[PDB]
Amino acid sequence: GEVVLKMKVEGMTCHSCTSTIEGKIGKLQGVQRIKVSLDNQEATIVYQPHLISVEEMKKQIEAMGFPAFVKKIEGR
């Protein structure tokens, strides 16, 4: 079963960079689900530390241009 992560998605500040990110990031190795809340300026992804390096997940978003950040991480 997967592990939850919560990420910060600062910089966008406009309700027009969710579904793109969600859908796109949906192809990333290790991701199982995504929910982006531009409202909250925050997002919740579910993945496992096998196909992704935990942080890489966020860094892919940083790579889009918008400086994001890591709030939560994998654990149990």
Short mmCIF file of all heavy atoms in Angstrom, two decimals:
data_model
loop_
_atom_site.label_atom_id
_atom_site.label_comp_id
_atom_site.label_asym_id
_atom_site.label_seq_id
_atom_site.Cartn_x
_atom_site.Cartn_y
_atom_site.Cartn_z
N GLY A 1 0.87 -1.18 0.00
CA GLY A 1 0.00 0.00 0.00
C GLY A 1 0.90 1.22 0.00
O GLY A 1 2.03 1.09 0.47
N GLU A 2 0.42 2.34 -0.54
CA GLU A 2 1.23 3.52 -0.77
C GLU A 2 1.38 4.34 0.50
O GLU A 2 0.77 4.03 1.53
CB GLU A 2 0.56 4.33 -1.88
CG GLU A 2 0.29 3.49 -3.13
CD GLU A 2 1.60 2.98 -3.71
OE1 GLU A 2 2.24 3.79 -4.41
OE2 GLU A 2 1.97 1.83 -3.40
N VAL A 3 2.18 5.40 0.41
CA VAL A 3 2.48 6.30 1.51
C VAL A 3 2.10 7.72 1.09
O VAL A 3 2.35 8.13 -0.05
CB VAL A 3 3.97 6.19 1.87
CG1 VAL A 3 4.19 6.81 3.25
CG2 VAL A 3 4.47 4.74 1.91
N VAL A 4 1.46 8.46 2.00
CA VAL A 4 1.05 9.83 1.75
C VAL A 4 2.25 10.78 1.91
O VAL A 4 3.13 10.54 2.72
CB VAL A 4 -0.16 10.16 2.65
CG1 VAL A 4 0.25 10.99 3.86
CG2 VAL A 4 -1.22 10.91 1.85
N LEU A 5 2.24 11.86 1.14
CA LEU A 5 3.18 12.97 1.25
C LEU A 5 2.34 14.23 1.04
O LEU A 5 1.42 14.23 0.22
CB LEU A 5 4.30 12.76 0.22
CG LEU A 5 4.95 14.01 -0.40
CD1 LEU A 5 4.00 14.77 -1.32
CD2 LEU A 5 5.67 14.89 0.63
N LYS A 6 2.63 15.30 1.79
CA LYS A 6 2.08 16.62 1.56
C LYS A 6 3.21 17.57 1.15
O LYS A 6 4.27 17.59 1.79
CB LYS A 6 1.29 17.11 2.79
CG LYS A 6 -0.21 17.32 2.47
CD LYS A 6 -0.70 18.74 2.75
CE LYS A 6 -1.22 18.96 4.18
NZ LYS A 6 -0.30 19.78 4.98
N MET A 7 2.99 18.30 0.06
CA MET A 7 3.94 19.21 -0.57
C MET A 7 3.33 20.61 -0.60
O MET A 7 2.11 20.76 -0.65
CB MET A 7 4.27 18.72 -1.99
CG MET A 7 3.03 18.38 -2.82
SD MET A 7 3.02 18.89 -4.56
CE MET A 7 4.59 18.25 -5.15
N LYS A 8 4.20 21.63 -0.59
CA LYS A 8 3.83 23.01 -0.79
C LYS A 8 4.05 23.34 -2.26
O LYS A 8 5.08 22.94 -2.82
CB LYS A 8 4.69 23.93 0.09
CG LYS A 8 3.93 24.55 1.27
CD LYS A 8 2.70 25.35 0.82
CE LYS A 8 2.18 26.31 1.89
NZ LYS A 8 0.72 26.44 1.80
N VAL A 9 3.10 24.06 -2.88
CA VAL A 9 3.18 24.44 -4.28
C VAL A 9 3.02 25.96 -4.34
O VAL A 9 2.02 26.49 -4.84
CB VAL A 9 2.14 23.68 -5.11
CG1 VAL A 9 2.43 23.88 -6.60
CG2 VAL A 9 2.20 22.17 -4.83
N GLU A 10 4.02 26.65 -3.80
CA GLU A 10 4.05 28.10 -3.82
C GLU A 10 4.29 28.61 -5.25
O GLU A 10 4.58 27.84 -6.16
CB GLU A 10 5.11 28.58 -2.82
CG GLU A 10 4.78 28.12 -1.39
CD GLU A 10 3.58 28.86 -0.80
OE1 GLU A 10 3.73 30.08 -0.59
OE2 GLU A 10 2.55 28.19 -0.55
N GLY A 11 4.14 29.91 -5.47
CA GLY A 11 4.53 30.55 -6.72
C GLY A 11 3.40 30.63 -7.74
O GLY A 11 3.25 31.66 -8.40
N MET A 12 2.62 29.56 -7.91
CA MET A 12 1.54 29.53 -8.91
C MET A 12 0.53 30.64 -8.66
O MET A 12 0.20 31.40 -9.57
CB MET A 12 0.85 28.16 -8.90
CG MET A 12 1.78 27.09 -9.47
SD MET A 12 1.14 25.41 -9.34
CE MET A 12 2.55 24.48 -9.97
N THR A 13 0.02 30.72 -7.42
CA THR A 13 -0.92 31.72 -6.93
C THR A 13 -2.12 32.00 -7.85
O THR A 13 -2.73 33.07 -7.74
CB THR A 13 -0.18 32.99 -6.47
OG1 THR A 13 -1.06 33.83 -5.75
CG2 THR A 13 0.42 33.79 -7.62
N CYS A 14 -2.50 31.06 -8.71
CA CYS A 14 -3.60 31.21 -9.65
C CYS A 14 -4.21 29.84 -9.88
O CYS A 14 -3.49 28.87 -10.12
CB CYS A 14 -3.09 31.79 -10.98
SG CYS A 14 -3.72 33.47 -11.19
N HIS A 15 -5.55 29.74 -9.83
CA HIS A 15 -6.31 28.51 -9.99
C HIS A 15 -6.35 28.08 -11.47
O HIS A 15 -7.41 27.92 -12.05
CB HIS A 15 -7.71 28.68 -9.38
CG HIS A 15 -8.40 29.99 -9.73
ND1 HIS A 15 -8.41 31.12 -8.94
CD2 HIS A 15 -9.07 30.28 -10.89
CE1 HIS A 15 -9.07 32.07 -9.62
NE2 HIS A 15 -9.49 31.61 -10.81
N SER A 16 -5.17 27.90 -12.07
CA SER A 16 -5.03 27.55 -13.48
C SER A 16 -3.75 26.72 -13.69
O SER A 16 -3.22 26.63 -14.79
CB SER A 16 -5.02 28.85 -14.29
OG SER A 16 -5.38 28.62 -15.64
N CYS A 17 -3.26 26.10 -12.61
CA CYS A 17 -2.10 25.22 -12.61
C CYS A 17 -2.35 24.17 -11.53
O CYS A 17 -1.64 24.08 -10.54
CB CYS A 17 -0.80 26.01 -12.39
SG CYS A 17 -0.02 26.43 -13.96
N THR A 18 -3.40 23.37 -11.74
CA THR A 18 -3.70 22.20 -10.94
C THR A 18 -3.71 21.02 -11.90
O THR A 18 -2.71 20.32 -12.00
CB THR A 18 -5.04 22.39 -10.23
OG1 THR A 18 -6.06 22.73 -11.16
CG2 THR A 18 -4.95 23.54 -9.22
N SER A 19 -4.79 20.85 -12.66
CA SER A 19 -5.03 19.65 -13.45
C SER A 19 -3.87 19.27 -14.35
O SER A 19 -3.47 18.11 -14.39
CB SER A 19 -6.37 19.78 -14.20
OG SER A 19 -6.68 18.58 -14.89
N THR A 20 -3.29 20.26 -15.02
CA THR A 20 -2.04 20.09 -15.72
C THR A 20 -1.01 19.35 -14.87
O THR A 20 -0.51 18.29 -15.26
CB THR A 20 -1.54 21.48 -16.13
OG1 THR A 20 -2.43 22.02 -17.08
CG2 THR A 20 -0.13 21.37 -16.71
N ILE A 21 -0.66 19.93 -13.72
CA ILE A 21 0.28 19.35 -12.80
C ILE A 21 -0.21 17.98 -12.36
O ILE A 21 0.55 17.03 -12.44
CB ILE A 21 0.52 20.36 -11.65
CG1 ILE A 21 1.53 21.42 -12.10
CG2 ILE A 21 1.00 19.72 -10.34
CD1 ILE A 21 0.85 22.63 -12.73
N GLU A 22 -1.47 17.84 -11.96
CA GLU A 22 -2.00 16.60 -11.43
C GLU A 22 -1.82 15.47 -12.45
O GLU A 22 -1.08 14.52 -12.24
CB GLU A 22 -3.46 16.82 -11.00
CG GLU A 22 -3.50 17.79 -9.81
CD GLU A 22 -4.90 18.19 -9.38
OE1 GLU A 22 -5.55 18.89 -10.18
OE2 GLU A 22 -5.25 17.83 -8.23
N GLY A 23 -2.50 15.63 -13.58
CA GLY A 23 -2.40 14.77 -14.75
C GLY A 23 -0.95 14.46 -15.14
O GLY A 23 -0.59 13.29 -15.26
N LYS A 24 -0.11 15.48 -15.35
CA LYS A 24 1.28 15.29 -15.73
C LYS A 24 1.99 14.42 -14.69
O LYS A 24 2.56 13.38 -15.02
CB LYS A 24 1.99 16.65 -15.88
CG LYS A 24 3.43 16.53 -16.38
CD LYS A 24 3.50 16.47 -17.92
CE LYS A 24 4.66 15.59 -18.38
NZ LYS A 24 5.00 15.81 -19.81
N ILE A 25 1.95 14.86 -13.44
CA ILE A 25 2.62 14.21 -12.32
C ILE A 25 2.07 12.79 -12.13
O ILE A 25 2.81 11.90 -11.72
CB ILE A 25 2.50 15.13 -11.10
CG1 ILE A 25 3.29 16.44 -11.24
CG2 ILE A 25 2.79 14.42 -9.79
CD1 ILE A 25 4.78 16.21 -11.30
N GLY A 26 0.82 12.55 -12.51
CA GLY A 26 0.22 11.24 -12.58
C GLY A 26 1.04 10.21 -13.37
O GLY A 26 0.87 9.01 -13.14
N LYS A 27 1.92 10.62 -14.30
CA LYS A 27 2.74 9.70 -15.05
C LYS A 27 4.05 9.39 -14.31
O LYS A 27 4.79 8.51 -14.74
CB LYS A 27 3.01 10.28 -16.44
CG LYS A 27 1.89 9.92 -17.42
CD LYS A 27 2.21 10.47 -18.82
CE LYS A 27 1.27 9.93 -19.90
NZ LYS A 27 1.49 8.49 -20.18
N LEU A 28 4.38 10.13 -13.25
CA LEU A 28 5.68 10.01 -12.63
C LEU A 28 5.83 8.67 -11.94
O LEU A 28 4.91 8.18 -11.27
CB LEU A 28 5.89 11.14 -11.62
CG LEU A 28 6.02 12.57 -12.17
CD1 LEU A 28 7.46 13.03 -11.97
CD2 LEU A 28 5.73 12.74 -13.66
N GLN A 29 7.01 8.08 -12.08
CA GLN A 29 7.28 6.76 -11.56
C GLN A 29 7.13 6.78 -10.04
O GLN A 29 7.87 7.47 -9.34
CB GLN A 29 8.69 6.30 -11.98
CG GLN A 29 8.71 4.78 -12.17
CD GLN A 29 8.15 4.37 -13.53
OE1 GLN A 29 7.04 3.84 -13.62
NE2 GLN A 29 8.90 4.61 -14.59
N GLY A 30 6.15 6.03 -9.52
CA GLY A 30 5.93 5.87 -8.09
C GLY A 30 4.64 6.53 -7.64
O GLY A 30 4.15 6.18 -6.57
N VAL A 31 4.09 7.47 -8.41
CA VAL A 31 2.88 8.15 -8.00
C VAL A 31 1.67 7.26 -8.25
O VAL A 31 1.57 6.61 -9.29
CB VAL A 31 2.81 9.50 -8.74
CG1 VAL A 31 1.38 9.99 -8.99
CG2 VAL A 31 3.57 10.55 -7.92
N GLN A 32 0.73 7.27 -7.30
CA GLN A 32 -0.51 6.52 -7.35
C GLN A 32 -1.71 7.46 -7.36
O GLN A 32 -2.68 7.21 -8.08
CB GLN A 32 -0.53 5.51 -6.20
CG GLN A 32 -0.37 4.07 -6.69
CD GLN A 32 -1.72 3.39 -6.90
OE1 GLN A 32 -2.30 2.85 -5.97
NE2 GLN A 32 -2.24 3.42 -8.12
N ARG A 33 -1.67 8.55 -6.59
CA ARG A 33 -2.69 9.59 -6.67
C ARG A 33 -2.09 10.94 -6.33
O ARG A 33 -1.07 11.01 -5.63
CB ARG A 33 -3.86 9.24 -5.72
CG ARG A 33 -5.23 9.70 -6.25
CD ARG A 33 -5.72 8.79 -7.38
NE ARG A 33 -7.03 9.24 -7.90
CZ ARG A 33 -7.72 8.60 -8.86
NH1 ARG A 33 -7.21 7.50 -9.42
NH2 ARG A 33 -8.91 9.07 -9.25
N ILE A 34 -2.74 12.01 -6.80
CA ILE A 34 -2.40 13.39 -6.53
C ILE A 34 -3.70 14.16 -6.26
O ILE A 34 -4.73 13.81 -6.83
CB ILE A 34 -1.57 13.98 -7.69
CG1 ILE A 34 -1.16 15.42 -7.36
CG2 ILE A 34 -2.32 13.93 -9.04
CD1 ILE A 34 0.12 15.85 -8.09
N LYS A 35 -3.65 15.14 -5.36
CA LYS A 35 -4.67 16.16 -5.15
C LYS A 35 -3.94 17.49 -4.94
O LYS A 35 -3.24 17.62 -3.94
CB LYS A 35 -5.49 15.84 -3.89
CG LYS A 35 -6.54 14.73 -4.04
CD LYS A 35 -6.07 13.35 -3.53
CE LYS A 35 -7.29 12.52 -3.11
NZ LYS A 35 -6.94 11.16 -2.65
N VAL A 36 -4.10 18.46 -5.84
CA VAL A 36 -3.53 19.80 -5.69
C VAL A 36 -4.61 20.79 -5.25
O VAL A 36 -5.68 20.85 -5.87
CB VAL A 36 -2.83 20.23 -6.99
CG1 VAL A 36 -2.31 21.67 -6.92
CG2 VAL A 36 -1.62 19.33 -7.25
N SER A 37 -4.35 21.56 -4.19
CA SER A 37 -5.24 22.59 -3.67
C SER A 37 -4.56 23.95 -3.84
O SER A 37 -3.89 24.43 -2.93
CB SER A 37 -5.57 22.27 -2.21
OG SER A 37 -6.47 23.21 -1.65
N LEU A 38 -4.73 24.57 -5.02
CA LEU A 38 -4.20 25.90 -5.27
C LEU A 38 -4.71 26.88 -4.22
O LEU A 38 -3.94 27.70 -3.73
CB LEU A 38 -4.54 26.34 -6.70
CG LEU A 38 -3.32 26.84 -7.48
CD1 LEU A 38 -2.82 28.19 -6.96
CD2 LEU A 38 -2.16 25.85 -7.55
N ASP A 39 -5.98 26.75 -3.81
CA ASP A 39 -6.57 27.45 -2.67
C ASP A 39 -5.62 27.43 -1.48
O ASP A 39 -5.24 28.47 -0.95
CB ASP A 39 -7.86 26.75 -2.24
CG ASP A 39 -8.82 26.51 -3.39
OD1 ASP A 39 -8.40 25.78 -4.32
OD2 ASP A 39 -9.94 27.07 -3.33
N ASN A 40 -5.27 26.21 -1.05
CA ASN A 40 -4.47 26.02 0.15
C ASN A 40 -2.98 26.29 -0.15
O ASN A 40 -2.14 26.34 0.75
CB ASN A 40 -4.72 24.62 0.72
CG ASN A 40 -4.47 24.52 2.22
OD1 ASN A 40 -3.78 25.32 2.82
ND2 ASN A 40 -5.07 23.52 2.86
N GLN A 41 -2.64 26.43 -1.44
CA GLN A 41 -1.28 26.63 -1.95
C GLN A 41 -0.43 25.39 -1.64
O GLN A 41 0.79 25.44 -1.51
CB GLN A 41 -0.70 27.95 -1.43
CG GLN A 41 -1.79 29.01 -1.48
CD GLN A 41 -1.29 30.41 -1.14
OE1 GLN A 41 -0.78 30.64 -0.05
NE2 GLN A 41 -1.45 31.35 -2.06
N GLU A 42 -1.14 24.28 -1.47
CA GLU A 42 -0.63 23.04 -0.90
C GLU A 42 -1.25 21.86 -1.65
O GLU A 42 -2.28 22.01 -2.31
CB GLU A 42 -0.90 23.04 0.62
CG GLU A 42 0.21 22.38 1.44
CD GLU A 42 0.31 22.90 2.88
OE1 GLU A 42 0.47 24.13 3.02
OE2 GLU A 42 0.30 22.06 3.81
N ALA A 43 -0.60 20.70 -1.60
CA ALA A 43 -0.98 19.56 -2.41
C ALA A 43 -0.61 18.28 -1.66
O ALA A 43 0.27 18.30 -0.80
CB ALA A 43 -0.28 19.67 -3.76
N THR A 44 -1.29 17.17 -1.97
CA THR A 44 -1.17 15.90 -1.31
C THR A 44 -0.94 14.88 -2.42
O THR A 44 -1.77 14.79 -3.33
CB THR A 44 -2.47 15.63 -0.56
OG1 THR A 44 -2.63 16.56 0.49
CG2 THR A 44 -2.49 14.21 0.01
N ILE A 45 0.17 14.15 -2.37
CA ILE A 45 0.46 13.08 -3.31
C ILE A 45 0.57 11.78 -2.53
O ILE A 45 0.86 11.80 -1.33
CB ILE A 45 1.71 13.41 -4.13
CG1 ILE A 45 1.48 14.74 -4.84
CG2 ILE A 45 2.01 12.34 -5.19
CD1 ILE A 45 2.79 15.37 -5.28
N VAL A 46 0.32 10.64 -3.18
CA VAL A 46 0.51 9.33 -2.61
C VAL A 46 1.44 8.53 -3.54
O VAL A 46 1.20 8.49 -4.76
CB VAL A 46 -0.83 8.69 -2.26
CG1 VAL A 46 -1.48 8.09 -3.47
CG2 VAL A 46 -0.69 7.63 -1.17
N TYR A 47 2.52 7.99 -2.98
CA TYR A 47 3.57 7.27 -3.68
C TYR A 47 4.29 6.34 -2.71
O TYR A 47 3.96 6.32 -1.53
CB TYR A 47 4.57 8.26 -4.32
CG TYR A 47 5.28 9.20 -3.36
CD1 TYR A 47 6.33 8.75 -2.53
CD2 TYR A 47 5.00 10.58 -3.42
CE1 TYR A 47 7.04 9.66 -1.73
CE2 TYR A 47 5.79 11.49 -2.71
CZ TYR A 47 6.78 11.04 -1.82
OH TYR A 47 7.51 11.93 -1.10
N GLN A 48 5.30 5.59 -3.18
CA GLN A 48 6.16 4.78 -2.34
C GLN A 48 7.66 5.03 -2.60
O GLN A 48 8.06 5.20 -3.75
CB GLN A 48 5.81 3.31 -2.54
CG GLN A 48 5.56 3.01 -4.01
CD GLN A 48 5.52 1.52 -4.30
OE1 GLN A 48 6.53 0.94 -4.69
NE2 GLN A 48 4.37 0.87 -4.13
N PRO A 49 8.50 5.02 -1.54
CA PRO A 49 9.95 5.16 -1.64
C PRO A 49 10.56 3.89 -2.23
O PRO A 49 11.16 3.08 -1.53
CB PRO A 49 10.43 5.42 -0.21
CG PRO A 49 9.43 4.63 0.62
CD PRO A 49 8.12 4.84 -0.14
N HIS A 50 10.39 3.73 -3.54
CA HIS A 50 10.94 2.64 -4.32
C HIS A 50 11.18 3.16 -5.73
O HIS A 50 12.30 3.13 -6.24
CB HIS A 50 9.96 1.45 -4.35
CG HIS A 50 10.39 0.30 -3.47
ND1 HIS A 50 10.83 0.40 -2.17
CD2 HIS A 50 10.51 -1.00 -3.85
CE1 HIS A 50 11.20 -0.83 -1.78
NE2 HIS A 50 11.02 -1.72 -2.77
N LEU A 51 10.11 3.66 -6.34
CA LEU A 51 10.14 4.18 -7.69
C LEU A 51 10.57 5.66 -7.68
O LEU A 51 11.01 6.16 -8.71
CB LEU A 51 8.76 3.98 -8.32
CG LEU A 51 8.42 2.49 -8.52
CD1 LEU A 51 6.91 2.27 -8.56
CD2 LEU A 51 9.05 1.90 -9.79
N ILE A 52 10.45 6.34 -6.53
CA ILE A 52 10.84 7.72 -6.34
C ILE A 52 11.75 7.88 -5.13
O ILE A 52 11.64 7.13 -4.17
CB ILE A 52 9.58 8.57 -6.25
CG1 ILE A 52 9.88 10.06 -6.44
CG2 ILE A 52 8.88 8.37 -4.91
CD1 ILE A 52 10.41 10.34 -7.84
N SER A 53 12.62 8.90 -5.16
CA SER A 53 13.58 9.17 -4.11
C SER A 53 13.02 10.09 -3.03
O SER A 53 13.77 10.83 -2.40
CB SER A 53 14.85 9.74 -4.71
OG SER A 53 15.35 8.86 -5.70
N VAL A 54 11.70 10.06 -2.85
CA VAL A 54 10.91 10.80 -1.87
C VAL A 54 10.85 12.27 -2.28
O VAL A 54 9.78 12.82 -2.54
CB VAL A 54 11.41 10.51 -0.44
CG1 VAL A 54 11.78 11.74 0.39
CG2 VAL A 54 10.37 9.71 0.33
N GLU A 55 12.01 12.90 -2.36
CA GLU A 55 12.17 14.30 -2.62
C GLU A 55 12.07 14.56 -4.12
O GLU A 55 11.47 15.57 -4.51
CB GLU A 55 13.49 14.78 -2.03
CG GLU A 55 13.24 16.05 -1.20
CD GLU A 55 14.52 16.60 -0.60
OE1 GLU A 55 15.02 15.94 0.33
OE2 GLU A 55 14.95 17.67 -1.07
N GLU A 56 12.58 13.63 -4.95
CA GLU A 56 12.55 13.79 -6.40
C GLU A 56 11.17 14.24 -6.87
O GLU A 56 11.04 15.20 -7.61
CB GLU A 56 12.97 12.49 -7.07
CG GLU A 56 14.49 12.40 -7.21
CD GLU A 56 15.03 13.48 -8.14
OE1 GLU A 56 14.56 13.50 -9.30
OE2 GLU A 56 15.85 14.28 -7.66
N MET A 57 10.14 13.57 -6.35
CA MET A 57 8.75 13.91 -6.56
C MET A 57 8.50 15.43 -6.57
O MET A 57 7.91 15.95 -7.50
CB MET A 57 7.92 13.20 -5.50
CG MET A 57 6.83 12.33 -6.13
SD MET A 57 5.49 13.23 -6.95
CE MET A 57 6.09 13.17 -8.65
N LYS A 58 8.95 16.13 -5.53
CA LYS A 58 8.81 17.57 -5.40
C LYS A 58 9.71 18.27 -6.40
O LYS A 58 9.30 19.22 -7.07
CB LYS A 58 9.22 17.97 -3.97
CG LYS A 58 8.06 18.42 -3.09
CD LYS A 58 7.76 17.41 -1.98
CE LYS A 58 7.34 16.02 -2.49
NZ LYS A 58 8.39 15.01 -2.25
N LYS A 59 10.96 17.83 -6.49
CA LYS A 59 11.94 18.46 -7.36
C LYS A 59 11.47 18.47 -8.81
O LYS A 59 11.79 19.40 -9.55
CB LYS A 59 13.30 17.78 -7.16
CG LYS A 59 14.06 18.40 -5.98
CD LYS A 59 13.27 18.53 -4.66
CE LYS A 59 14.13 19.17 -3.57
NZ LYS A 59 14.60 20.51 -3.96
N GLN A 60 10.66 17.50 -9.23
CA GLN A 60 10.08 17.47 -10.56
C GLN A 60 9.16 18.68 -10.73
O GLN A 60 9.16 19.33 -11.77
CB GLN A 60 9.30 16.17 -10.74
CG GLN A 60 10.16 14.94 -10.42
CD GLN A 60 10.40 13.99 -11.58
OE1 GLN A 60 10.27 14.35 -12.75
NE2 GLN A 60 10.76 12.75 -11.27
N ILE A 61 8.39 18.97 -9.69
CA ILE A 61 7.55 20.16 -9.65
C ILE A 61 8.41 21.42 -9.65
O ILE A 61 8.12 22.33 -10.43
CB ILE A 61 6.52 20.10 -8.51
CG1 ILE A 61 5.39 19.11 -8.85
CG2 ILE A 61 5.82 21.44 -8.29
CD1 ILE A 61 5.77 17.69 -8.48
N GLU A 62 9.48 21.48 -8.86
CA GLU A 62 10.39 22.63 -8.88
C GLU A 62 10.85 22.86 -10.32
O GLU A 62 10.79 23.98 -10.84
CB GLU A 62 11.58 22.40 -7.93
CG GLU A 62 11.17 22.43 -6.45
CD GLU A 62 12.25 21.87 -5.52
OE1 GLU A 62 13.42 21.78 -5.92
OE2 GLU A 62 11.93 21.49 -4.37
N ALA A 63 11.24 21.77 -10.99
CA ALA A 63 11.68 21.75 -12.37
C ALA A 63 10.66 22.35 -13.35
O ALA A 63 11.05 22.84 -14.40
CB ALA A 63 12.03 20.32 -12.77
N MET A 64 9.35 22.33 -13.02
CA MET A 64 8.34 22.94 -13.87
C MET A 64 8.55 24.46 -13.95
O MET A 64 8.16 25.08 -14.94
CB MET A 64 6.92 22.64 -13.36
CG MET A 64 6.62 21.14 -13.26
SD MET A 64 6.52 20.22 -14.81
CE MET A 64 6.53 18.54 -14.16
N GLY A 65 9.14 25.05 -12.90
CA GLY A 65 9.42 26.48 -12.84
C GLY A 65 8.99 27.06 -11.50
O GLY A 65 9.62 27.98 -10.98
N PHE A 66 7.89 26.54 -10.93
CA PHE A 66 7.32 27.07 -9.71
C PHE A 66 8.09 26.52 -8.51
O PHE A 66 8.11 25.30 -8.33
CB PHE A 66 5.84 26.67 -9.62
CG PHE A 66 5.00 27.32 -10.70
CD1 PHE A 66 4.62 26.59 -11.85
CD2 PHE A 66 4.71 28.69 -10.63
CE1 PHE A 66 3.91 27.22 -12.88
CE2 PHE A 66 4.03 29.33 -11.67
CZ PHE A 66 3.60 28.59 -12.79
N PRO A 67 8.73 27.36 -7.68
CA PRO A 67 9.49 26.90 -6.53
C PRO A 67 8.53 26.29 -5.51
O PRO A 67 7.76 27.01 -4.87
CB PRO A 67 10.23 28.13 -6.01
CG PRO A 67 9.34 29.30 -6.44
CD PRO A 67 8.74 28.82 -7.76
N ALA A 68 8.55 24.97 -5.38
CA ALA A 68 7.69 24.20 -4.49
C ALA A 68 8.46 23.90 -3.21
O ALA A 68 9.52 24.48 -2.97
CB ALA A 68 7.27 22.93 -5.24
N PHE A 69 7.94 23.01 -2.37
CA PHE A 69 8.63 22.64 -1.14
C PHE A 69 8.06 21.35 -0.54
O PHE A 69 6.94 20.94 -0.86
CB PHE A 69 8.58 23.79 -0.13
CG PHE A 69 9.72 23.77 0.87
CD1 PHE A 69 10.97 24.29 0.50
CD2 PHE A 69 9.54 23.23 2.16
CE1 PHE A 69 12.04 24.28 1.41
CE2 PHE A 69 10.62 23.18 3.05
CZ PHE A 69 11.87 23.72 2.68
N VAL A 70 8.84 20.71 0.33
CA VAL A 70 8.48 19.47 1.02
C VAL A 70 7.97 19.78 2.44
O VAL A 70 8.69 20.38 3.23
CB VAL A 70 9.63 18.46 0.93
CG1 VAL A 70 10.80 18.88 1.79
CG2 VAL A 70 9.19 17.04 1.34
N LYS A 71 6.72 19.41 2.75
CA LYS A 71 6.19 19.53 4.10
C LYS A 71 6.26 18.19 4.84
O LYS A 71 6.87 18.09 5.90
CB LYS A 71 4.75 20.05 4.11
CG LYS A 71 4.66 21.52 3.70
CD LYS A 71 3.43 22.16 4.37
CE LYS A 71 3.69 22.57 5.83
NZ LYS A 71 2.51 23.27 6.39
N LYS A 72 5.57 17.17 4.31
CA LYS A 72 5.57 15.83 4.86
C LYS A 72 6.49 14.94 4.03
O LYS A 72 7.13 15.41 3.09
CB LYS A 72 4.13 15.30 4.99
CG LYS A 72 3.84 14.75 6.40
CD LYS A 72 3.82 15.85 7.47
CE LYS A 72 3.82 15.24 8.88
NZ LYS A 72 4.18 16.23 9.92
N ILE A 73 6.61 13.67 4.42
CA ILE A 73 7.50 12.69 3.81
C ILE A 73 6.88 11.32 4.00
O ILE A 73 5.83 11.20 4.64
CB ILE A 73 8.93 12.76 4.41
CG1 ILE A 73 8.99 13.55 5.72
CG2 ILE A 73 9.87 13.33 3.35
CD1 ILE A 73 10.32 13.38 6.46
N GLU A 74 7.53 10.29 3.45
CA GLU A 74 7.09 8.92 3.63
C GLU A 74 7.43 8.51 5.07
O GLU A 74 8.35 9.06 5.67
CB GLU A 74 7.77 8.03 2.57
CG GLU A 74 9.26 7.78 2.83
CD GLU A 74 9.54 6.64 3.81
OE1 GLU A 74 8.59 5.86 4.07
OE2 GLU A 74 10.70 6.55 4.25
N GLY A 75 6.65 7.59 5.65
CA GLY A 75 6.93 6.99 6.94
C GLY A 75 5.73 6.13 7.32
O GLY A 75 4.71 6.17 6.63
N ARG A 76 5.84 5.37 8.41
CA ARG A 76 4.76 4.63 9.02
C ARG A 76 5.23 4.28 10.42
O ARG A 76 6.43 4.54 10.68
CB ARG A 76 4.44 3.36 8.20
CG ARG A 76 2.98 2.94 8.42
CD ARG A 76 2.72 1.56 7.80
NE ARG A 76 1.43 1.52 7.10
CZ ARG A 76 0.85 0.42 6.61
NH1 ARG A 76 1.42 -0.78 6.82
NH2 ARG A 76 -0.28 0.51 5.91
#
